[PDB]
């Protein structure tokens, strides 16, 4: 059963 | 014999169900390329992923690649207009975005299928000659500042950066990827940096062709797509850049055996347990991290979570491997914490180690690998067809990790059983490697450190050697067992033949007092899958705050008790959704339609005979309180929407009312409520997928029968089927409700211009107007005026009524925001006059493309129908109707509309504004002209406001 910048 | 192409791959392995066609290749400049042909597709798409990200930021300019990413959309040498790209997409039914991780920058868009080339040509220029215009740079730096601002008080982002600050400060890992006004403008100015240079320099250094993957999806042939990609992309310069590596783990010796105590913003209790591991990515074919993730993270009988839940220490658990970068990774186990749990962290962790120890004792288990492998094979074979935009974006990323031929399968198919790797990873999950973080409000004022970027209060401590020792001598504990064979794995995948009387839309195949059943056999996707959707009505689910609370709690307690049994179904692609609504309850069961009747029956049976555990009730209730309380920590713009919902709906209980009422909820009271709730119902259902009319009727009847049999449920009267109405606003009126957000130092605003009930014509007026103003609004309010990061417009639909809305989260005050939207609105009318006849028809065509976009998968289709059903419009063919009508409309028709309903001095203007002030604001009193505004009627009290106004009709069912 296994952060980042949007525009 | 083509110089531009370095090589074509062999057959790219697809699911046999995948009708799309594929070609892999590598350009001469080294760019890896996947081409996808789908002659049926309504939108086309492409994506590019550069293997560089914030981990390669210059140390002196944090967030430069994130910044660079924002800037590429703002003009190139070949298309210099700041928003040509944005606008081209907008008026051709497309959209676009991008993101920056530590090692990647990923750019993608979709567009109407027959404007691929146009879009792609503009797209390519991002990587050839971006302008980085100087005044664009000055403006956009605020968008980024705003983006960061929004994250500052968010608990996830704080922990995310705190991990980074507590490892080797020397390591690239410890960098702040987002950037802000300070790091991208203020500080660089002080330090004499020319940022346009640094952007040019960085782009030039790292945007090398050798670090780039491109995926393109369109209707064209593979040959046509080939020439296209070659044409636009082989001119990207190969600057031969070595791909960055990070062999050294950011957590070195001194960073292990550490304990962190963290004060959160929301009132949450969490335990994060972390072990550093080497980069497992290369073992993708055997995947030892996944195996251990599956096991340690298991939720069924005998599982780790299971014991911790029974001791009343935790409620949920996540475990398994976690990305780092090329060269390092993490293995995590994080749980949430009951009040007891907080006082037993040491014991939680010992149980963690006891479970791990059990995995050692038993050793690696081929049948567990076999199961994982089969599930993945099934998942892959019958994967839903993806929306092109997300698909291209995702493949672009993985093109950097997998042979061309494997890009489709590499994340699914497992091949190699590796007890050695499983053993090796397992050997790292040891007390001498551990990092422990506790997040709780009880560390208020007991902390002595501050993370610089977010302001996170925390304390650090060596875990005592004596404690490490205790964890190292962890016995086997009898309550821990490996999971057993998963009985839910589906084995029957036949697609039932299409019945003689299958219909294009769902048919009402049962209409009785108890239940109303909508049904459609899948005539499109042919996967062994089904969606079963149930809407249960009871007046008791929402009759008052206390009843809301109970409806919720009941449903949480049910799910919680069902959890162990349902987890297996979930690994097997069979899941369920169950929540209380303002009308009663919602149940959805989704997935392979082999073992679905089983899970469904278990659920209904459980809800109808539910037996509540005393201890589980106390824990869940306590959590729910904190949950309601934690609303005060949501973004200002979320607050704004919340308040508008409360103001405009006939009946709506506030969070304050709910939490106040929650103290009266006792065990006795709840037990009485359930049978009460369950005693009278109406059920409206959508059954849709790989099932027949007979099967459907039986499923529905089985549900009903289970309720009768166990809860004595009888029907509801047609007249009792109470839908709530939207408040009706008075012509030329304007109201303002204002409130304060106490956590965030930004303000939020929602502006709603109510128009009229939904109907073919009113829908299309609003929709077209929204289409036209869509991009210009973003472009004016954000790109030009830089009012905030969050800038939104478009239709608002609720209770059969509708209107236009704007949502902005900003540093500026709400009255100011109001002003600028009003200005913008004048611009728009002026613009609609100045715009050509074609420009106008282009917008019609864009809306049309959007509205007519065929669902790519079962869920998407179900969703469309379910919208018609729950809104009780049942307008299943609405799309051709409304598009048919749309084409009739002219510039005159829209100007009339704007003049009638929207313009500042419109005869029928109906305006509500929600102002949510920033933490620090106290009062609430070159750019285009803003019109003088009327005196707003300030809403003092919601109940009063509603009592003083009409209520709209409910929509007449089609």
From Swiss-Prot, chain A:
Subcellular location: Secreted
Gene giving rise to this polypeptide: IAPP
Functional note: Amylin/IAPP is a glucoregulatory peptide hormone that plays an important role in the regulation of energy homeostasis. Selectively inhibits insulin-stimulated glucose utilization and glycogen deposition in muscle, while not affecting adipocyte glucose metabolism. IAPP function is mediated by the CALCR-RAMPs (AMYRs) receptor complexes. Amylin can also bind CALCR receptor in the absence of RAMPs, although it is more selective for AMYRs.
Coiled coil: none
Name listed for the protein in its UniProt record: Islet amyloid polypeptide
Oligomer status and interactors: Can form homodimers. Interacts with IDE and INS. Interaction with INS inhibits homodimerization and fibril formation.
Annotated domain remarks: The mature protein is largely unstructured in the absence of a cognate ligand, and has a strong tendency to form fibrillar aggregates. Homodimerization may be the first step of amyloid formation.
Organism this protein belongs to: Homo sapiens (Human)
Effect of residue 6 to A/D/S: Promotes formation of fibrillar aggregates
Note: IAPP is the peptide subunit of amyloid found in pancreatic islets of type 2 diabetic patients and in insulinomas.
PTM comment text: Amyloid fibrils are degraded by insulin-degrading enzyme IDE.
Family: Belongs to the calcitonin family.
Range of the intact protein held here: 34 to 49 of 89
From Swiss-Prot, chain B:
Subcellular location: Cytoplasm, Cytosol; Cell membrane; Secreted
InterPro entries for the chain: Metalloenz_LuxS/M16, Pept_M16_N, Pept_M16_Zn_BS, Peptidase_M16, Peptidase_M16_C, Peptidase_M16_M, PqqF-like_C_4
PTM notes: The N-terminus is blocked.
Amino acids binding Zn(2+): 66, 70, 147
Motif SlyX motif boundaries: 811-816
Active site (UniProt): 69
Effect of residue 725 to A: Decreases dimerization. No effect on degradation of ANP. Retains the ability to degrade an aberrant form of ANP, when in the presence of both ANP and the aberrant ANP
Regulation: Activated by small peptides. Activated by ATP and GTP, and to a lesser extent by CTP, TTP and PPPi. Inhibited by bacitracin. In vitro modification of Cys residues impairs enzyme activity.
Residues recorded with modification N6-succinyllysine: 150, 655
Catalytic activity: Degradation of insulin, glucagon and other polypeptides. No action on proteins
Residues engaged in binding substrate: 294-300, 317-321
EC id: 3.4.24.56
Keywords of the record: Allosteric enzyme, ATP-binding, Cell membrane, Cytoplasm, Host cell receptor for virus entry, Host-virus interaction, Hydrolase, Membrane, Metal-binding, Metalloprotease, Nucleotide-binding, Protease, Receptor, Secreted, Zinc
Variant or mutagenesis effect after changing residue 786 to C: Increases catalytic rate towards INS and amyloid
Cellular component terms per the entry's GO annotation: basolateral plasma membrane; cell surface; cytoplasm; cytosol; cytosolic proteasome complex; external side of plasma membrane; extracellular exosome; extracellular space
Leftover remarks: ATP-binding induces a conformation change.
Family: Belongs to the peptidase M16 family.
Domain comment (free text): The SlyX motif may be involved in the non-conventional secretion of the protein.
UniProt name for this protein: Insulin-degrading enzyme
Organism: Homo sapiens (Human)
């Amino acid at each position: 059963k296994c952060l980042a910048n949007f525009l | 014999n083509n110089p531009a192409i370095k090589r074509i791959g062999n057959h790219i392995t697809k699911s046999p169900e995948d009708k799309r066609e594929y070609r892999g290749l590598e350009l001469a400049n080294g760019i890896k390329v996947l081409l996808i042909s789908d002659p049926t597709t309504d939108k086309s798409s492409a994506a590019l992923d550069v293997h560089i990200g914030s981990l390669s930021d210059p140390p002196n300019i944090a967030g430069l690649s994130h910044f660079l990413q924002h800037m590429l959309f703002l003009g190139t040498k070949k298309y210099p207009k700041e928003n040509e790209y944005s606008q081209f997409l907008s008026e051709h039914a497309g959209s676009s975005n991008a993101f920056t991780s530590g090692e990647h920058t990923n750019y993608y868009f979709d567009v109407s299928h027959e404007h691929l080339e146009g879009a792609l040509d503009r797209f390519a220029q991002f990587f050839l000659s971006p302008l980085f215009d100087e005044s664009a740079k000055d403006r956009e730096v605020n968008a980024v500042d705003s983006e960061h601002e929004k994250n500052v008080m968010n608990d996830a982002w704080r922990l995310f950066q705190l991990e980074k600050a507590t490892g080797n400060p020397k390591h690239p890992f410890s960098k702040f990827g987002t950037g802000n006004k300070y790091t991208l403008e203020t500080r660089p100015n002080q330090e004499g940096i020319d940022v346009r240079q640094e952007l040019l320099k960085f782009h030039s250094a790292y945007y090398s062709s050798n670090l780039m993957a491109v995926v393109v999806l369109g209707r064209e042939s593979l040959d046509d797509l080939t020439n296209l990609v070659v044409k636009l992309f082989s001119e990207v310069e190969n600057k031969n850049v070595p791909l960055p590596e990070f062999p050294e783990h950011p957590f070195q010796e001194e960073h292990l055996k550490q304990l962190y105590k963290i004060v959160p913003i929301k009132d949450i209790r969490n335990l994060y347990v972390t072990f550093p591991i080497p980069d497992l990515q290369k073992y993708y074919k055997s995947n030892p991290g996944h195996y251990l993730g599956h096991l340690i993270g298991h939720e069924g009988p005998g599982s780790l979570l299971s014991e911790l839940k029974s001791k009343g220490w935790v409620n949920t658990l996540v475990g398994g491997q976690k990305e780092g970068a090329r060269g390092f990774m993490f293995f995590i186990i994080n749980v949430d914490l009951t009040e007891e749990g907080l006082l037993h962290v040491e014991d939680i962790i010992l149980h963690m180690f006891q479970y791990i120890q059990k995995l050692r004792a038993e050793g690696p288990q081929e049948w567990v690998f076999q199961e994982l492998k089969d599930l993945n094979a099934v998942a892959f074979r019958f994967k839903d067809k993806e929306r092109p935009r997300g698909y291209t974006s995702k493949i672009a990323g993985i093109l950097h990790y997998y042979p061309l031929e494997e890009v489709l399968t590499a994340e699914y198919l497992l091949e190699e059983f590796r007890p050695d790797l499983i053993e090796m990873v397992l050997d790292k999950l040891r007390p001498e490697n551990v990092r422990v973080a506790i997040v709780s409000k009880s560390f208020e004022g007991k902390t002595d450190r501050t993370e610089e970027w977010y302001g996170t209060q925390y304390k650090q401590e060596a875990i005592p050697d004596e404690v490490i020792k205790k964890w190292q001598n962890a016995d086997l504990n009898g309550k821990f067992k490996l999971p057993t064979k998963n009985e839910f794995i589906p084995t029957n995948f036949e697609i039932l033949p299409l019945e003689k009387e299958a219909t294009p839309y769902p048919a009402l195949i049962k209409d009785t007092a108890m239940s109303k059943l909508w049904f459609k056999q899948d005539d499109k996707f042919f996967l062994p899958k089904a969606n079963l959707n149930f809407e249960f009505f009871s007046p008791f689910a929402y009759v008052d705050p206390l009843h809301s609370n109970m409806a919720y709690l009941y449903l949480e307690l049910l799910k919680d008790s069902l959890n162990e049994y349902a987890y297996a179904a979930e690994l097997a692609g069979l899941s369920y959704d169950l929540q209380n609504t303002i009308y009663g309850m919602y149940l959805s069961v989704k997935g392979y339609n082999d073992k679905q009747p089983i899970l469904l029956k278990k659920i209904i049976e459980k809800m109808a005979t539910f037996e509540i555990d005393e201890k589980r009730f106390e824990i869940i209730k306590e959590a729910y309180m904190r949950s309601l309380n934690n609303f005060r920590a949501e973004q200002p713009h979320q607050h704004a929407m919340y308040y508008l919902r409360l103001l405009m709906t006939e009946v709506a209980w506030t969070k304050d009312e709910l939490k106040e009422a929650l103290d009266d909820v006792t065990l006795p009271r709840l037990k009485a409520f359930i049978p009460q709730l369950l005693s009278r119902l109406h059920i409206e259902a959508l059954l849709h997928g790989n099932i027949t009319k007979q099967a459907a009727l039986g499923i529905m009847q089985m549900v009903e029968d289970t309720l009768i049999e166990h809860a004595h449920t009888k029907p509801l009267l047609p007249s009792q089927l109470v839908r709530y109405r939207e408040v009706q606003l008075p012509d030329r009126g304007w109201f303002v409700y204002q409130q304060r957000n106490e956590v965030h130092n930004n303000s939020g605003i929602e502006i709603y211009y109510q128009t009229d009930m939904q109907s073919t014509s009113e829908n299309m007026f609003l929709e077209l107007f929204a289409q036209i103003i869509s991009e210009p609004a973003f472009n004016t309010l954000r790109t030009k005026e830089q009012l905030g990061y969050i800038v939104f417009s478009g239709p608002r639909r609720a209770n059969g009524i509708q209107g236009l809305r704007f949502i902005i989260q900003s540093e500026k005050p709400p009255h100011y925001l109001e002003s600028r939207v009003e200005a913008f609105l004048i611009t728009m009318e002026k613009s609609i006059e100045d715009m050509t006849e074609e420009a106008f028809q282009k917008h019609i065509q864009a809306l049309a493309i959007r509205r007519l976009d065929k669902p790519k998968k079962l869920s998407a289709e179900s969703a469309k129908y379910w919208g018609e059903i729950i809104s009780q419009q049942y307008n299943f063919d609405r799309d051709n109707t409304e598009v048919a009508y749309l084409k009739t409309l002219t510039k005159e028709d829209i100007i009339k509309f704007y003049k009638e309903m929207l313009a500042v001095d419109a005869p029928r203007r109906h305006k509500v504004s929600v102002h949510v002030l920033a933490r620090e604001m106290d009062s609430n009193p070159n750019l285009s002209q803003a019109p003088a505004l009327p005196q707003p009627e300030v809403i003092q009290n919601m109940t009063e406001f509603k009592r003083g106004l009409p209520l709209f009709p409910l929509v007449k069912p089609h």
